[PDB]
Design an enzyme around this catalytic site. Structure first.
Site, mmCIF file in Angstrom:
data_model
loop_
_atom_site.group_PDB
_atom_site.id
_atom_site.type_symbol
_atom_site.label_atom_id
_atom_site.label_comp_id
_atom_site.label_asym_id
_atom_site.label_seq_id
_atom_site.Cartn_x
_atom_site.Cartn_y
_atom_site.Cartn_z
ATOM 1 N N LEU A 56 -18.823 -5.306 20.741
ATOM 2 C CA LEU A 56 -17.859 -5.148 21.842
ATOM 3 C C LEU A 56 -16.421 -5.384 21.377
ATOM 4 O O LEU A 56 -16.433 -6.021 20.363
ATOM 5 C CB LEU A 56 -18.122 -6.250 22.815
ATOM 6 N N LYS A 66 -20.816 -16.716 14.482
ATOM 7 C CA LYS A 66 -20.907 -17.975 15.274
ATOM 8 C C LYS A 66 -21.980 -17.807 16.255
ATOM 9 O O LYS A 66 -22.612 -18.718 16.604
ATOM 10 C CB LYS A 66 -19.439 -18.439 15.888
ATOM 11 N N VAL A 97 -2.424 -32.609 30.932
ATOM 12 C CA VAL A 97 -1.435 -33.264 31.735
ATOM 13 C C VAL A 97 -0.329 -31.936 31.674
ATOM 14 O O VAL A 97 0.089 -31.469 30.839
ATOM 15 C CB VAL A 97 -0.792 -34.588 31.452
ATOM 16 N N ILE A 100 2.835 -31.911 29.187
ATOM 17 C CA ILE A 100 2.385 -32.087 27.847
ATOM 18 C C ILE A 100 1.580 -30.922 27.236
ATOM 19 O O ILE A 100 0.645 -30.209 27.656
ATOM 20 C CB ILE A 100 1.242 -33.302 27.954
ATOM 21 N N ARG A 177 -5.041 -10.718 46.600
ATOM 22 C CA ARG A 177 -6.229 -9.667 46.481
ATOM 23 C C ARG A 177 -7.477 -9.975 47.032
ATOM 24 O O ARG A 177 -8.290 -9.146 47.264
ATOM 25 C CB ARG A 177 -6.319 -9.622 44.864
ATOM 26 N N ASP A 184 -3.064 -22.191 42.282
ATOM 27 C CA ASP A 184 -1.531 -22.754 42.605
ATOM 28 C C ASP A 184 -1.351 -21.443 43.888
ATOM 29 O O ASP A 184 -2.137 -20.628 44.139
ATOM 30 C CB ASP A 184 -0.905 -22.736 41.664
HETATM 31 NA NA NA Z 1 -0.319 -29.289 29.604
HETATM 32 NA NA NA Z 2 -15.919 -5.684 17.962
HETATM 33 NA NA NA Z 3 -2.641 -27.368 29.577
#
Ligand code: NA
Ligand code: NA
Ligand code: NA
Ligand code: NA
EC number: 2.7.7.7
Length: 327
Positions: A56, A66, A97, A100, A177, A184
């Site tokens: 892909l 992995k 947060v 942050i 959509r 949000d």
């Molecule tokens: Na943050």
């Molecule tokens: Na690939």
């Molecule tokens: Na974040």
DNA sequence: CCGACGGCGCATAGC
DNA sequence: GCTCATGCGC
DNA sequence: GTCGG
């Protein structure tokens, strides 16, 4: 495709993505892992080997290996080791947060500040945004059901119109959509008074009115063209309070409003395809404008836009309403 | 081999 | 005081 | 990390 299928791989890759962004500060690996995670999520087969997935786009040798490990063993060694590393998981966590990011989280954890409790007891070390992010930590990770978004839309459209009936406002994002839910509220705003070639109080007045009817409860940032803040639906008398929600309001020149509306409606995948096809026809579309390209590839002046359809007409595409802009 | 990978508005060291 | 790089969110 | 010039 269901989580059944490759949700194990997809959660693994997202975990790896988060540690690249928040701990290693490697944004491009973050997106690489997110890119692999999504193309895999779209794959309507349960993956049986790393080699199968390496076919892909965006999955390469390393994610291939992995997946092999995950499939043979049900775990990933690197993930488990990082999952129990106190410094790494603390840094990763604090970035939840809003306000942050990787750098603030790194400095907080370097000083013993590891948890929301530690933040709560070190607020003279947080800026205004981080303080608000802390105060609303739980509410901001909640999702917004579509009926609350309509209710929110009602308030924003009614109050904007109260300030000046000539304003135009649209709620964009996945909400526009048709999304069952949202994270949000993204409001695009314009006025006939505001063009590329034309007051500094058009945004402030809408924000202000929305604070006076006590819809906007908090400000994260605000300037001449962009507002980022918090809002909350009014509690239904003797009923539980609504969660505070994240709201953005951006003020756009009218001659770029509909390019802005297009762009912020999305989808993201839709926007790439439309901008890809647009160049095959000699135009370049960005957030702001659509422009013609001469034979030597140099952009001319941006063409008039007055509808979303205008941009579709320019590139000889049929209008697709936001419902059909998933890609 | 080696760079690109989105780019910008607003809040927050150095002169 | 000012300019502006860095951080951040999107 | 993956891709592609
Ligand atoms: Na943050
Ligand atoms: Na690939
Ligand atoms: Na974040
Ligand atoms: Na009026």
């Amino acid at each position: 495709p269901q989580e059944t299928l490759n949700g194990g791989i997809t959660d693994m890759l997202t975990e790896l993505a988060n540690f690249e962004k928040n701990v290693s500060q490697a944004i491009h690996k973050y997106n690489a892992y997110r890119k692999a995670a999504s193309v895999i999520a779209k794959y309507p087969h349960k993956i049986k080997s790393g080699a199968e997935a390496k076919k892909l786009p965006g999955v390469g040798t390393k994610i291939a290996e992995k997946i092999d490990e995950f499939l043979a063993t049900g775990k990933l060694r690197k993930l488990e080791k990082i999952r129990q590393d106190d410094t790494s998981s603390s840094i990763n966590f604090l970035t939840r947060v809003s306000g942050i990011g990787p750098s603030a989280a790194r400095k907080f954890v370097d000083e013993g500040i590891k948890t929301l409790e530690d933040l709560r007891k070190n607020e003279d070390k947080l800026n205004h945004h981080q303080r608000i992010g802390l105060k609303y930590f739980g509410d901001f990770e909640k999702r917004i059901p579509r009926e609350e978004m309509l209710q929110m839309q009602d308030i924003v459209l009614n109050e904007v119109k109260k300030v000046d009936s000539e304003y135009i406002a649209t709620v964009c994002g996945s909400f526009r959509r048709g999304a069952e839910s949202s994270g949000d509220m993204d409001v695009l705003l314009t006025h006939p008074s505001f063009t590329s070639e034309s007051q500094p109080k058009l945004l402030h007045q809408v924000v202000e009115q929305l604070q006076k009817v006590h819809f906007i409860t908090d400000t994260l940032s605000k300037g001449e063209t962009k507002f980022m803040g918090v809002c909350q639906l009014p509690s239904k008398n003797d009923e539980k309070e609504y969660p505070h929600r994240r709201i953005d309001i951006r003020l756009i020149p009218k001659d770029q409003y509909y390019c802005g509306v297009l762009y912020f409606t999305g989808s993201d995948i839709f926007n790439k395809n439309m901008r890809a096809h647009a160049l095959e026809k000699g135009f370049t579309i960005n957030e702001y404008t659509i422009r013609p390209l001469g034979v030597t590839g140099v952009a001319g002046e941006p063409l008039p836009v007055d509808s979303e359809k205008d941009i579709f007409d320019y590139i000889q595409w049929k209008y697709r309403e936001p419902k059909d802009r998933s890609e």
